[PDB]
Design a protein around this ligand. Structure first.
Ligand SMILES: N=C(N)c1ccc(CO)cc1
Ligand SMILES: [Ca+2]
Ligand SMILES: [Mg+2]
Length: 223
């Protein structure tokens, strides 16, 4: 997260860290046994770290649970990044408490201008590279489909939203991928792509979660 702030410890209780020896992507806990993330994050083996604030220290609220099943959207396209979404089934259910909690899936898509909360342990620098210990947060609005499409001509599908700023300086980044965009209590976005990070007229592009509730619920029910 570039241009953010340090979240209050455990204030984003649905945020997970996906770990394969080190943190590599975020995710969101959307059922006691399921995390949703980005398909471009795929690895064949994943440990899900719930309840984290400092990913570099064991502070006691953490639950470390291995992925039992990893399911990428069948129509994920690695070129266009359309359908950039993945589900992870935990090997045992997460235990839900104040520090580890599910986030609602969307009841509707979000209006342009809706304020959202973006979070992750990704890069915090717009030049160079710094990876934080502590979870980072960013408040940012849903942009119009128009403002999104003018920024990325021909590249925004109906399954993508832009969330962020046109001025630059405030965006998600590498290592935030897969993580949450939560707007009015609902998971509306998954960190997916953009051109660099926090550049002028290159807002973050996010998987449009409100188009995937049937895919998520159908995949959960089968497994
Ligand atoms: N600018 C962004 N929001 C952004 C986020 C994530 C990624 C993942 O490489 C690229 C860009
Ligand atoms: Ca920790
Ligand atoms: Mg580090």
């Amino acid at each position: 997260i570039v241009g953010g702030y340090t979240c209050a410890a455990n204030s984003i209780p649905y945020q997970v860290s996906l770990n394969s020896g080190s943190h590599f992507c975020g995710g969101s806990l959307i059922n006691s046994q399921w995390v949703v993330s980005a398909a471009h994050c795929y690895k064949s083996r994943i440990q899900v770290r719930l309840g984290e604030h400092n990913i570099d220290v064991l502070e006691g609220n953490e639950q470390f649970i291995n992925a039992a099943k990893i399911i990428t959207h069948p129509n994920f396209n690695g070129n266009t990044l359309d359908n950039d979404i993945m589900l992870i089934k935990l090997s045992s259910p997460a235990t839900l408490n104040s520090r580890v909690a599910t986030v609602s899936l969307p009841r509707s898509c979000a209006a342009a201008g809706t304020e959202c909360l973006i979070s992750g342990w990704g890069n915090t620098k717009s030049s160079g590279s710094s990876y934080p210990s502590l979870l980072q947060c960013l408040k940012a609005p849903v942009l119009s489909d128009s403002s999104c499409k003018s920024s990325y001509p021909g590249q925004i599908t109906g399954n993508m939203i832009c969330v962020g700023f046109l001025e630059g300086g405030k965006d998600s980044c590498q290592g935030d991928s897969g993580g949450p965009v939560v707007c009015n209590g609902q998971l509306q976005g998954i960190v997916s792509w953009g051109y660099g990070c926090a550049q002028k007229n290159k807002p973050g592009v996010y998987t449009k979660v409100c188009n995937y509730v049937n895919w998520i619920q159908q995949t959960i029910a089968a497994n």
